[PDB]
Amino acid sequence: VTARLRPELAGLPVYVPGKTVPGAIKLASNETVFGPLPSVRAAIDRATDTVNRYPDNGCVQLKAALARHLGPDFAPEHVAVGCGSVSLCQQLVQVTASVGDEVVFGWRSFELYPPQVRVAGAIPIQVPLTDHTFDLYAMLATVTDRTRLIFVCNPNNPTSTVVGPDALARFVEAVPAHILIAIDEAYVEYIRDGMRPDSLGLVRAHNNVVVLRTFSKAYGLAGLRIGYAIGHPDVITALDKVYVPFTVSSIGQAAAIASLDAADELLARTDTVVAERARVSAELRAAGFTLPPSQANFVWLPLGSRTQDFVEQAADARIVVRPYGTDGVRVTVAAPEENDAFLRFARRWRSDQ
Amino acid sequence: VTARLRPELAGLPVYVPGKTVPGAIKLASNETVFGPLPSVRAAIDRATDTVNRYPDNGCVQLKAALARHLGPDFAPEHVAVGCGSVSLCQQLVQVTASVGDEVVFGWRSFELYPPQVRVAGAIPIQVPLTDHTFDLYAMLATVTDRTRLIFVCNPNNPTSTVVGPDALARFVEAVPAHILIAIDEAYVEYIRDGMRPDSLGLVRAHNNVVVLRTFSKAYGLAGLRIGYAIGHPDVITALDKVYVPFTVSSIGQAAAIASLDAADELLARTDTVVAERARVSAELRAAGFTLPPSQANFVWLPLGSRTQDFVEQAADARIVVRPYGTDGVRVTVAAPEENDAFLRFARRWRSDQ
Ligand SMILES: Cc1ncc(COP(=O)(O)O)c(CN[C@@H](Cc2ccccc2)C(=O)O)c1O
Ligand SMILES: *Cc1c(COP(=O)(O)O)cnc(C)c1O
Ligand SMILES: N[C@@H](Cc1ccccc1)C(=O)O
């Protein structure tokens, strides 16, 4: 006899990290490459003084700062904070979907959507992509009476691509207005080529749109775990009901506030990443690789059954990239010397095939 | 029209941030009063250098340190880590209970038990205490075909009491073996008078027992959010399947490992708390208050309908204590001069009744 656990746990699609290759160049986690600004370390140092005290559960000053950052139409009541946007992903399922309810998203997409939906006893509706891109028409066709939540990942992880900004608006307009739609905008700060949607305009115009963002990437605080959701006050209130209390640390909040104060400098750095992304993409395509147009801080290599081998051999060259089954490899765009090292590996590996 | 959210959210509380008055004495969150040791600050400071990188999702070094700390009977496979033990409480519900299922606990007890159970669509079976203590017999009598999880909070929050250590073993031996039992031991470090149960021994002897502990109180890291569970490897594996990835921060892991290195010093400090707890209890009893025997870092005042008034008047005197409905007030034992300020207020308040 053992402790009886839920049958849903059986072969639950777990998030598995990449194995650590000591000293390897880290192109597997979509991290930016710079340590904290002086003002961010100072805020962290000051917050370290009171590590014996619980954080502000309501993240009051952080919400105020976020609403200010967001603009005049946004107040603290429109903002929920979570322990990474990954926590907010689960909170969205928890406020919308239970047993038998359906959650729709393009697939392949963020690897945590399926397990988080399954943990709730809900049914993941995984809609195939075309041109490695969310197919909004196919997703809409997939809606039923049991649909309680839709995830639009934009840019998409792991395929790197974006939908058209007006297409997104038409999609939102077409979805029954009582179904919550979450636009996961983890890489929104890297979009260029006039493809960035009117994210805030959409939440202003639609009560059922919620936008998710993160401090982990462009704002460089992946280690400290701060994400936020922007939406209608009733949606925000619900997210905070299921929020596990105190999960956003005091150091996290302090660092996040200091980072918003330095947004202009931090956002400006994304230009350099975009330039390197364009260069890495061009050189890969020149060497014979196929990949879609990226609007994030990584590219997607649909290598199929060669995925495992690519990633194993990269690891032999002290380079860590992220495999996805037998679909493809996601490679983060990092510092120029690091990207060149990846490129030398890629060209050699290609020639050998 | 608004987004349709789960109706079960009506069973969950909204918290609303109360006043944050400068100079108020903080006796409402069960916190210890000392800031970080030099070695803990150093761990935090060094992990800050790489805040742009994600944490170790598997908390490998922290689990190894916990397994050491636990001794030769326990390996990393017996340990799950969570973003505070509050996160692990939810994870326990997620591996055991869904719609229709029953979760048993004493009541009044940890304020998070009911909402976390409601979130899963499960039903909380709230069993009345006897003399402000868990009634283990009454709890056993409430067990049914639908019972998937039992919480025993020991010491109990908010009533401060423990069950007999031998009685706890008898109860565990008597519970049907397929039912997971969680022993919440957030205040275990404060138990004295021969009342500490053989917590680890219960884990070793029963596949269905899990123990929850925290770095928030005795180890003084409430701000950083690290809890842990000790259990059978298959239960631990399950907890880690529903674990929200990267929620335990890099700074949190670094700080916890360093605190474990300083366990002797940190644990030695609990003796002073216990001395204050006894003094506070005696002084309250001389003033005419009746309270049960505490084994935590707080005392419980069963003031019934007078609790709201007590707490409000304390707040006017710049003292923060925690109300629990019309049941009672939980008062943290902290620095002697804070405790004296509280006692002066309590004495005045009582003589005014
Ligand atoms: C599309 C998308 N949404 C959310 C998140 C989570 O970011 P957070 O704000 O929680 O740091 C990501 C991030 N993806 C990375 C890292 C990761 C984090 C949690 C779980 C799995 C992976 C990745 O490697 O996929 C994202 O892309
Ligand atoms: C304080 C407390 C905890 C610990 O919470 P953390 O999330 O570890 O800070 C757990 N359980 C109970 C009943 C408590 O009172
Ligand atoms: N989350 C509640 C209750 C709580 C207190 C302490 C720990 C966990 C939960 C609060 O704001 O205080």
mmCIF file with all atom_site columns, C-alpha atoms in Angstrom, chain A residues 1-6 8-12 14-15 17 20 26 29-36 40-41 44-46 48-58 60 83 86-87 90 93-99 101 112 115-116 119-121 148 177-180 207-208 214 216-217 220-225 232 234-235 237-238 240-242 244-251 338, chain B residues 1-6 8-10 12-15 17 26-27 29-36 40-41 44-46 48-58 83 86-87 90 93-99 101 112 115-116 119-121 148 177-180 207-208 214 216-217 220-225 232 234-235 238 240-251 322 338:
data_model
loop_
_atom_site.group_PDB
_atom_site.id
_atom_site.type_symbol
_atom_site.label_atom_id
_atom_site.label_alt_id
_atom_site.label_comp_id
_atom_site.label_asym_id
_atom_site.label_entity_id
_atom_site.label_seq_id
_atom_site.pdbx_PDB_ins_code
_atom_site.Cartn_x
_atom_site.Cartn_y
_atom_site.Cartn_z
_atom_site.occupancy
_atom_site.B_iso_or_equiv
_atom_site.pdbx_formal_charge
_atom_site.auth_seq_id
_atom_site.auth_comp_id
_atom_site.auth_asym_id
_atom_site.auth_atom_id
_atom_site.pdbx_PDB_model_num
ATOM 1   C CA . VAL A 1 1   ? 0.000   0.000  0.000   1.00 0.00 ? 1   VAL A CA 1
ATOM 2   C CA . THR A 1 2   ? 1.157   3.529  -0.878  1.00 0.00 ? 2   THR A CA 1
ATOM 3   C CA . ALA A 1 3   ? -0.331  7.005  -0.576  1.00 0.00 ? 3   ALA A CA 1
ATOM 4   C CA . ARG A 1 4   ? -3.074  7.369  -3.182  1.00 0.00 ? 4   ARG A CA 1
ATOM 5   C CA . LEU A 1 5   ? -2.150  10.219 -5.542  1.00 0.00 ? 5   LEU A CA 1
ATOM 6   C CA . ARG A 1 6   ? -4.156  11.725 -8.397  1.00 0.00 ? 6   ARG A CA 1
ATOM 7   C CA . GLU A 1 8   ? -3.650  12.742 -13.624 1.00 0.00 ? 8   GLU A CA 1
ATOM 8   C CA . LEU A 1 9   ? -0.029  12.856 -12.410 1.00 0.00 ? 9   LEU A CA 1
ATOM 9   C CA . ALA A 1 10  ? 0.693   9.733  -14.499 1.00 0.00 ? 10  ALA A CA 1
ATOM 10  C CA . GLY A 1 11  ? 2.989   10.757 -17.330 1.00 0.00 ? 11  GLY A CA 1
ATOM 11  C CA . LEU A 1 12  ? 2.245   14.402 -16.571 1.00 0.00 ? 12  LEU A CA 1
ATOM 12  C CA . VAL A 1 14  ? 6.945   17.746 -16.750 1.00 0.00 ? 14  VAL A CA 1
ATOM 13  C CA . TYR A 1 15  ? 9.240   20.709 -17.456 1.00 0.00 ? 15  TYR A CA 1
ATOM 14  C CA . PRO A 1 17  ? 15.671  21.595 -17.605 1.00 0.00 ? 17  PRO A CA 1
ATOM 15  C CA . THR A 1 20  ? 24.281  21.584 -16.908 1.00 0.00 ? 20  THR A CA 1
ATOM 16  C CA . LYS A 1 26  ? 24.336  29.425 -22.137 1.00 0.00 ? 26  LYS A CA 1
ATOM 17  C CA . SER A 1 29  ? 17.273  29.734 -21.394 1.00 0.00 ? 29  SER A CA 1
ATOM 18  C CA . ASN A 1 30  ? 16.596  32.977 -23.289 1.00 0.00 ? 30  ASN A CA 1
ATOM 19  C CA . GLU A 1 31  ? 18.597  34.993 -20.757 1.00 0.00 ? 31  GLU A CA 1
ATOM 20  C CA . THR A 1 32  ? 20.143  38.389 -21.437 1.00 0.00 ? 32  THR A CA 1
ATOM 21  C CA . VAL A 1 33  ? 23.868  38.617 -20.620 1.00 0.00 ? 33  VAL A CA 1
ATOM 22  C CA . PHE A 1 34  ? 24.325  41.611 -18.275 1.00 0.00 ? 34  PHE A CA 1
ATOM 23  C CA . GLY A 1 35  ? 24.437  41.623 -14.478 1.00 0.00 ? 35  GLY A CA 1
ATOM 24  C CA . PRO A 1 36  ? 22.403  44.108 -12.439 1.00 0.00 ? 36  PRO A CA 1
ATOM 25  C CA . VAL A 1 40  ? 19.238  47.547 -8.936  1.00 0.00 ? 40  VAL A CA 1
ATOM 26  C CA . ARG A 1 41  ? 22.020  46.034 -6.786  1.00 0.00 ? 41  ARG A CA 1
ATOM 27  C CA . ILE A 1 44  ? 18.613  44.476 -3.549  1.00 0.00 ? 44  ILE A CA 1
ATOM 28  C CA . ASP A 1 45  ? 21.231  45.287 -0.885  1.00 0.00 ? 45  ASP A CA 1
ATOM 29  C CA . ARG A 1 46  ? 18.772  47.520 1.005   1.00 0.00 ? 46  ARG A CA 1
ATOM 30  C CA . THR A 1 48  ? 18.510  42.252 2.144   1.00 0.00 ? 48  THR A CA 1
ATOM 31  C CA . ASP A 1 49  ? 18.566  44.123 5.489   1.00 0.00 ? 49  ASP A CA 1
ATOM 32  C CA . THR A 1 50  ? 15.041  42.899 6.353   1.00 0.00 ? 50  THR A CA 1
ATOM 33  C CA . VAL A 1 51  ? 15.144  39.341 5.005   1.00 0.00 ? 51  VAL A CA 1
ATOM 34  C CA . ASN A 1 52  ? 13.664  38.226 8.330   1.00 0.00 ? 52  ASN A CA 1
ATOM 35  C CA . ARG A 1 53  ? 10.378  40.026 7.465   1.00 0.00 ? 53  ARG A CA 1
ATOM 36  C CA . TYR A 1 54  ? 7.683   38.749 5.085   1.00 0.00 ? 54  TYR A CA 1
ATOM 37  C CA . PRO A 1 55  ? 7.301   40.609 1.774   1.00 0.00 ? 55  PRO A CA 1
ATOM 38  C CA . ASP A 1 56  ? 4.374   42.919 1.028   1.00 0.00 ? 56  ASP A CA 1
ATOM 39  C CA . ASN A 1 57  ? 1.773   40.369 -0.088  1.00 0.00 ? 57  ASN A CA 1
ATOM 40  C CA . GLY A 1 58  ? 0.033   43.020 -2.168  1.00 0.00 ? 58  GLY A CA 1
ATOM 41  C CA . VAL A 1 60  ? 1.742   47.786 -3.414  1.00 0.00 ? 60  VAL A CA 1
ATOM 42  C CA . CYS A 1 83  ? 6.445   34.775 -8.976  1.00 0.00 ? 83  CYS A CA 1
ATOM 43  C CA . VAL A 1 86  ? 5.045   31.155 -15.165 1.00 0.00 ? 86  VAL A CA 1
ATOM 44  C CA . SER A 1 87  ? 3.133   31.420 -11.894 1.00 0.00 ? 87  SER A CA 1
ATOM 45  C CA . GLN A 1 90  ? -1.030  28.657 -13.615 1.00 0.00 ? 90  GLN A CA 1
ATOM 46  C CA . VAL A 1 93  ? -5.866  28.274 -15.446 1.00 0.00 ? 93  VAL A CA 1
ATOM 47  C CA . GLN A 1 94  ? -6.925  28.349 -11.795 1.00 0.00 ? 94  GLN A CA 1
ATOM 48  C CA . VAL A 1 95  ? -9.322  31.268 -12.243 1.00 0.00 ? 95  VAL A CA 1
ATOM 49  C CA . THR A 1 96  ? -10.882 29.861 -15.457 1.00 0.00 ? 96  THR A CA 1
ATOM 50  C CA . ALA A 1 97  ? -10.727 26.100 -15.919 1.00 0.00 ? 97  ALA A CA 1
ATOM 51  C CA . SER A 1 98  ? -11.626 22.981 -13.984 1.00 0.00 ? 98  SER A CA 1
ATOM 52  C CA . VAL A 1 99  ? -12.547 19.374 -14.772 1.00 0.00 ? 99  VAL A CA 1
ATOM 53  C CA . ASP A 1 101 ? -13.099 22.583 -19.312 1.00 0.00 ? 101 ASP A CA 1
ATOM 54  C CA . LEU A 1 112 ? 4.205   24.692 -19.348 1.00 0.00 ? 112 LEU A CA 1
ATOM 55  C CA . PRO A 1 115 ? 1.001   20.388 -17.587 1.00 0.00 ? 115 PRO A CA 1
ATOM 56  C CA . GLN A 1 116 ? -0.628  23.404 -15.898 1.00 0.00 ? 116 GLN A CA 1
ATOM 57  C CA . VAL A 1 119 ? -3.025  19.693 -13.178 1.00 0.00 ? 119 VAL A CA 1
ATOM 58  C CA . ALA A 1 120 ? -6.360  21.554 -13.092 1.00 0.00 ? 120 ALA A CA 1
ATOM 59  C CA . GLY A 1 121 ? -8.101  18.519 -14.611 1.00 0.00 ? 121 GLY A CA 1
ATOM 60  C CA . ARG A 1 148 ? -12.613 28.734 -20.766 1.00 0.00 ? 148 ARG A CA 1
ATOM 61  C CA . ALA A 1 177 ? -16.392 37.856 -25.376 1.00 0.00 ? 177 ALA A CA 1
ATOM 62  C CA . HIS A 1 178 ? -16.842 35.771 -22.196 1.00 0.00 ? 178 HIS A CA 1
ATOM 63  C CA . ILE A 1 179 ? -13.719 33.607 -22.750 1.00 0.00 ? 179 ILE A CA 1
ATOM 64  C CA . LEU A 1 180 ? -10.535 34.937 -21.119 1.00 0.00 ? 180 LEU A CA 1
ATOM 65  C CA . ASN A 1 207 ? -12.772 43.064 -20.829 1.00 0.00 ? 207 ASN A CA 1
ATOM 66  C CA . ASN A 1 208 ? -11.680 39.481 -21.577 1.00 0.00 ? 208 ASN A CA 1
ATOM 67  C CA . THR A 1 214 ? 8.077   39.515 -17.312 1.00 0.00 ? 214 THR A CA 1
ATOM 68  C CA . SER A 1 216 ? 13.134  37.929 -16.527 1.00 0.00 ? 216 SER A CA 1
ATOM 69  C CA . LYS A 1 217 ? 14.433  38.807 -19.986 1.00 0.00 ? 217 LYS A CA 1
ATOM 70  C CA . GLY A 1 220 ? 17.338  41.035 -16.642 1.00 0.00 ? 220 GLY A CA 1
ATOM 71  C CA . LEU A 1 221 ? 15.897  39.703 -13.394 1.00 0.00 ? 221 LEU A CA 1
ATOM 72  C CA . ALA A 1 222 ? 15.335  36.034 -14.298 1.00 0.00 ? 222 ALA A CA 1
ATOM 73  C CA . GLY A 1 223 ? 16.936  34.933 -11.020 1.00 0.00 ? 223 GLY A CA 1
ATOM 74  C CA . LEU A 1 224 ? 14.486  36.897 -8.838  1.00 0.00 ? 224 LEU A CA 1
ATOM 75  C CA . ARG A 1 225 ? 11.146  35.806 -10.361 1.00 0.00 ? 225 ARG A CA 1
ATOM 76  C CA . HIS A 1 232 ? -9.779  44.173 -16.175 1.00 0.00 ? 232 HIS A CA 1
ATOM 77  C CA . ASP A 1 234 ? -12.317 41.647 -11.838 1.00 0.00 ? 234 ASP A CA 1
ATOM 78  C CA . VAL A 1 235 ? -9.778  39.450 -13.659 1.00 0.00 ? 235 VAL A CA 1
ATOM 79  C CA . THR A 1 237 ? -8.903  40.439 -8.366  1.00 0.00 ? 237 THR A CA 1
ATOM 80  C CA . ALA A 1 238 ? -9.419  36.752 -9.274  1.00 0.00 ? 238 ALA A CA 1
ATOM 81  C CA . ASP A 1 240 ? -4.887  37.650 -6.610  1.00 0.00 ? 240 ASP A CA 1
ATOM 82  C CA . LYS A 1 241 ? -7.377  35.316 -4.957  1.00 0.00 ? 241 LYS A CA 1
ATOM 83  C CA . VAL A 1 242 ? -5.403  32.303 -6.232  1.00 0.00 ? 242 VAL A CA 1
ATOM 84  C CA . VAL A 1 244 ? 0.064   31.911 -3.409  1.00 0.00 ? 244 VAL A CA 1
ATOM 85  C CA . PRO A 1 245 ? 0.739   34.504 -0.697  1.00 0.00 ? 245 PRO A CA 1
ATOM 86  C CA . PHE A 1 246 ? 4.192   36.035 -0.386  1.00 0.00 ? 246 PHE A CA 1
ATOM 87  C CA . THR A 1 247 ? 5.684   34.276 -3.437  1.00 0.00 ? 247 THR A CA 1
ATOM 88  C CA . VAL A 1 248 ? 6.982   37.563 -4.836  1.00 0.00 ? 248 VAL A CA 1
ATOM 89  C CA . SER A 1 249 ? 9.990   38.250 -2.574  1.00 0.00 ? 249 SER A CA 1
ATOM 90  C CA . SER A 1 250 ? 10.846  41.686 -1.119  1.00 0.00 ? 250 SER A CA 1
ATOM 91  C CA . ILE A 1 251 ? 14.146  41.647 -2.962  1.00 0.00 ? 251 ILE A CA 1
ATOM 92  C CA . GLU A 1 338 ? 29.132  33.756 -28.015 1.00 0.00 ? 338 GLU A CA 1
ATOM 93  C CA . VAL B 1 1   ? -19.939 41.274 -20.904 1.00 0.00 ? 1   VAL B CA 1
ATOM 94  C CA . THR B 1 2   ? -16.952 40.212 -18.830 1.00 0.00 ? 2   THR B CA 1
ATOM 95  C CA . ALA B 1 3   ? -14.704 37.149 -18.921 1.00 0.00 ? 3   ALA B CA 1
ATOM 96  C CA . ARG B 1 4   ? -16.325 34.131 -17.291 1.00 0.00 ? 4   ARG B CA 1
ATOM 97  C CA . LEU B 1 5   ? -14.336 33.036 -14.222 1.00 0.00 ? 5   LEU B CA 1
ATOM 98  C CA . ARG B 1 6   ? -14.779 29.995 -11.973 1.00 0.00 ? 6   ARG B CA 1
ATOM 99  C CA . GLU B 1 8   ? -15.636 28.540 -6.867  1.00 0.00 ? 8   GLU B CA 1
ATOM 100 C CA . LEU B 1 9   ? -13.668 31.803 -6.427  1.00 0.00 ? 9   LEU B CA 1
ATOM 101 C CA . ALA B 1 10  ? -16.555 32.979 -4.227  1.00 0.00 ? 10  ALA B CA 1
ATOM 102 C CA . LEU B 1 12  ? -11.844 32.561 -1.493  1.00 0.00 ? 12  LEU B CA 1
ATOM 103 C CA . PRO B 1 13  ? -10.978 35.668 0.529   1.00 0.00 ? 13  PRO B CA 1
ATOM 104 C CA . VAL B 1 14  ? -9.788  39.072 -0.693  1.00 0.00 ? 14  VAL B CA 1
ATOM 105 C CA . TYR B 1 15  ? -7.136  40.383 1.710   1.00 0.00 ? 15  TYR B CA 1
ATOM 106 C CA . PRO B 1 17  ? -3.804  45.854 2.487   1.00 0.00 ? 17  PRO B CA 1
ATOM 107 C CA . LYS B 1 26  ? 5.232   44.099 14.415  1.00 0.00 ? 26  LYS B CA 1
ATOM 108 C CA . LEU B 1 27  ? 3.749   41.177 16.365  1.00 0.00 ? 27  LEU B CA 1
ATOM 109 C CA . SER B 1 29  ? 3.457   37.751 11.294  1.00 0.00 ? 29  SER B CA 1
ATOM 110 C CA . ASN B 1 30  ? 5.450   35.336 13.540  1.00 0.00 ? 30  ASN B CA 1
ATOM 111 C CA . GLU B 1 31  ? 8.747   36.771 12.302  1.00 0.00 ? 31  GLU B CA 1
ATOM 112 C CA . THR B 1 32  ? 12.054  36.638 14.180  1.00 0.00 ? 32  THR B CA 1
ATOM 113 C CA . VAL B 1 33  ? 13.734  40.005 14.775  1.00 0.00 ? 33  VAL B CA 1
ATOM 114 C CA . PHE B 1 34  ? 17.307  39.602 13.532  1.00 0.00 ? 34  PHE B CA 1
ATOM 115 C CA . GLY B 1 35  ? 18.657  40.510 10.091  1.00 0.00 ? 35  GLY B CA 1
ATOM 116 C CA . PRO B 1 36  ? 20.940  38.290 8.023   1.00 0.00 ? 36  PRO B CA 1
ATOM 117 C CA . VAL B 1 40  ? 23.974  34.853 4.584   1.00 0.00 ? 40  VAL B CA 1
ATOM 118 C CA . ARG B 1 41  ? 24.317  38.401 3.277   1.00 0.00 ? 41  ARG B CA 1
ATOM 119 C CA . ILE B 1 44  ? 22.837  36.760 -1.267  1.00 0.00 ? 44  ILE B CA 1
ATOM 120 C CA . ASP B 1 45  ? 25.371  39.344 -2.532  1.00 0.00 ? 45  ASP B CA 1
ATOM 121 C CA . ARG B 1 46  ? 27.187  36.822 -4.698  1.00 0.00 ? 46  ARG B CA 1
ATOM 122 C CA . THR B 1 48  ? 23.091  38.874 -7.139  1.00 0.00 ? 48  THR B CA 1
ATOM 123 C CA . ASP B 1 49  ? 25.956  38.969 -9.647  1.00 0.00 ? 49  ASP B CA 1
ATOM 124 C CA . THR B 1 50  ? 24.040  36.545 -11.890 1.00 0.00 ? 50  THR B CA 1
ATOM 125 C CA . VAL B 1 51  ? 20.455  37.777 -11.346 1.00 0.00 ? 51  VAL B CA 1
ATOM 126 C CA . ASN B 1 52  ? 20.112  37.820 -15.146 1.00 0.00 ? 52  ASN B CA 1
ATOM 127 C CA . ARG B 1 53  ? 20.319  33.995 -15.087 1.00 0.00 ? 53  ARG B CA 1
ATOM 128 C CA . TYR B 1 54  ? 17.462  31.653 -14.085 1.00 0.00 ? 54  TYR B CA 1
ATOM 129 C CA . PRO B 1 55  ? 17.839  29.710 -10.828 1.00 0.00 ? 55  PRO B CA 1
ATOM 130 C CA . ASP B 1 56  ? 18.584  26.014 -10.700 1.00 0.00 ? 56  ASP B CA 1
ATOM 131 C CA . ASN B 1 57  ? 15.100  24.603 -11.160 1.00 0.00 ? 57  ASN B CA 1
ATOM 132 C CA . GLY B 1 58  ? 15.992  21.405 -9.276  1.00 0.00 ? 58  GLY B CA 1
ATOM 133 C CA . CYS B 1 83  ? 8.567   28.963 -2.687  1.00 0.00 ? 83  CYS B CA 1
ATOM 134 C CA . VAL B 1 86  ? 2.752   27.885 1.641   1.00 0.00 ? 86  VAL B CA 1
ATOM 135 C CA . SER B 1 87  ? 3.537   26.837 -1.948  1.00 0.00 ? 87  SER B CA 1
ATOM 136 C CA . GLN B 1 90  ? -0.941  23.980 -2.471  1.00 0.00 ? 90  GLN B CA 1
ATOM 137 C CA . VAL B 1 93  ? -3.511  19.494 -2.562  1.00 0.00 ? 93  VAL B CA 1
ATOM 138 C CA . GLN B 1 94  ? -2.601  19.320 -6.257  1.00 0.00 ? 94  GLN B CA 1
ATOM 139 C CA . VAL B 1 95  ? -1.082  15.824 -5.975  1.00 0.00 ? 95  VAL B CA 1
ATOM 140 C CA . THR B 1 96  ? -3.992  14.430 -3.886  1.00 0.00 ? 96  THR B CA 1
ATOM 141 C CA . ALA B 1 97  ? -7.322  16.218 -4.285  1.00 0.00 ? 97  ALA B CA 1
ATOM 142 C CA . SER B 1 98  ? -9.656  17.283 -7.084  1.00 0.00 ? 98  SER B CA 1
ATOM 143 C CA . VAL B 1 99  ? -13.433 17.761 -7.436  1.00 0.00 ? 99  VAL B CA 1
ATOM 144 C CA . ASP B 1 101 ? -12.566 14.819 -2.804  1.00 0.00 ? 101 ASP B CA 1
ATOM 145 C CA . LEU B 1 112 ? -4.640  28.906 3.806   1.00 0.00 ? 112 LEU B CA 1
ATOM 146 C CA . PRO B 1 115 ? -8.925  28.333 0.095   1.00 0.00 ? 115 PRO B CA 1
ATOM 147 C CA . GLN B 1 116 ? -6.231  26.083 -1.365  1.00 0.00 ? 116 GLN B CA 1
ATOM 148 C CA . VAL B 1 119 ? -9.205  26.183 -5.557  1.00 0.00 ? 119 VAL B CA 1
ATOM 149 C CA . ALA B 1 120 ? -8.870  22.494 -6.425  1.00 0.00 ? 120 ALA B CA 1
ATOM 150 C CA . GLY B 1 121 ? -12.668 22.192 -6.213  1.00 0.00 ? 121 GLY B CA 1
ATOM 151 C CA . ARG B 1 148 ? -7.363  12.269 -0.001  1.00 0.00 ? 148 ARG B CA 1
ATOM 152 C CA . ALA B 1 177 ? -2.520  3.824  4.940   1.00 0.00 ? 177 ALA B CA 1
ATOM 153 C CA . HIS B 1 178 ? -3.547  5.061  1.462   1.00 0.00 ? 178 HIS B CA 1
ATOM 154 C CA . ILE B 1 179 ? -4.287  8.581  2.765   1.00 0.00 ? 179 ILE B CA 1
ATOM 155 C CA . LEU B 1 180 ? -1.509  11.154 2.596   1.00 0.00 ? 180 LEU B CA 1
ATOM 156 C CA . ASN B 1 207 ? 5.123   5.870  3.165   1.00 0.00 ? 207 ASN B CA 1
ATOM 157 C CA . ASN B 1 208 ? 2.108   8.179  3.468   1.00 0.00 ? 208 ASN B CA 1
ATOM 158 C CA . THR B 1 214 ? 10.339  26.394 6.583   1.00 0.00 ? 214 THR B CA 1
ATOM 159 C CA . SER B 1 216 ? 10.880  31.708 7.396   1.00 0.00 ? 216 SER B CA 1
ATOM 160 C CA . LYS B 1 217 ? 10.912  31.751 11.186  1.00 0.00 ? 217 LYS B CA 1
ATOM 161 C CA . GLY B 1 220 ? 14.985  34.082 9.541   1.00 0.00 ? 220 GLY B CA 1
ATOM 162 C CA . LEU B 1 221 ? 14.410  34.146 5.772   1.00 0.00 ? 221 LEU B CA 1
ATOM 163 C CA . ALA B 1 222 ? 10.665  35.010 5.603   1.00 0.00 ? 222 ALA B CA 1
ATOM 164 C CA . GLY B 1 223 ? 11.484  37.553 2.901   1.00 0.00 ? 223 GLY B CA 1
ATOM 165 C CA . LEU B 1 224 ? 13.201  35.091 0.557   1.00 0.00 ? 224 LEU B CA 1
ATOM 166 C CA . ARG B 1 225 ? 10.580  32.305 0.501   1.00 0.00 ? 225 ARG B CA 1
ATOM 167 C CA . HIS B 1 232 ? 8.691   9.142  0.524   1.00 0.00 ? 232 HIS B CA 1
ATOM 168 C CA . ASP B 1 234 ? 7.376   8.845  -4.827  1.00 0.00 ? 234 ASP B CA 1
ATOM 169 C CA . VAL B 1 235 ? 5.464   11.569 -2.960  1.00 0.00 ? 235 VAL B CA 1
ATOM 170 C CA . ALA B 1 238 ? 4.785   13.975 -7.347  1.00 0.00 ? 238 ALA B CA 1
ATOM 171 C CA . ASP B 1 240 ? 8.033   18.162 -8.027  1.00 0.00 ? 240 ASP B CA 1
ATOM 172 C CA . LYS B 1 241 ? 5.721   17.394 -10.970 1.00 0.00 ? 241 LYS B CA 1
ATOM 173 C CA . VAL B 1 242 ? 3.302   20.168 -9.870  1.00 0.00 ? 242 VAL B CA 1
ATOM 174 C CA . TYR B 1 243 ? 6.081   22.488 -8.654  1.00 0.00 ? 243 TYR B CA 1
ATOM 175 C CA . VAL B 1 244 ? 5.922   25.818 -10.513 1.00 0.00 ? 244 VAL B CA 1
ATOM 176 C CA . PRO B 1 245 ? 9.381   25.953 -12.144 1.00 0.00 ? 245 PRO B CA 1
ATOM 177 C CA . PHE B 1 246 ? 12.034  28.393 -10.903 1.00 0.00 ? 246 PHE B CA 1
ATOM 178 C CA . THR B 1 247 ? 9.763   29.734 -8.123  1.00 0.00 ? 247 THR B CA 1
ATOM 179 C CA . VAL B 1 248 ? 12.553  29.124 -5.592  1.00 0.00 ? 248 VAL B CA 1
ATOM 180 C CA . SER B 1 249 ? 14.953  31.944 -6.454  1.00 0.00 ? 249 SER B CA 1
ATOM 181 C CA . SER B 1 250 ? 18.751  31.749 -6.772  1.00 0.00 ? 250 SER B CA 1
ATOM 182 C CA . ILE B 1 251 ? 19.166  34.177 -3.910  1.00 0.00 ? 251 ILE B CA 1
ATOM 183 C CA . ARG B 1 322 ? -3.462  39.377 14.219  1.00 0.00 ? 322 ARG B CA 1
ATOM 184 C CA . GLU B 1 338 ? 8.315   44.862 22.043  1.00 0.00 ? 338 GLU B CA 1
#
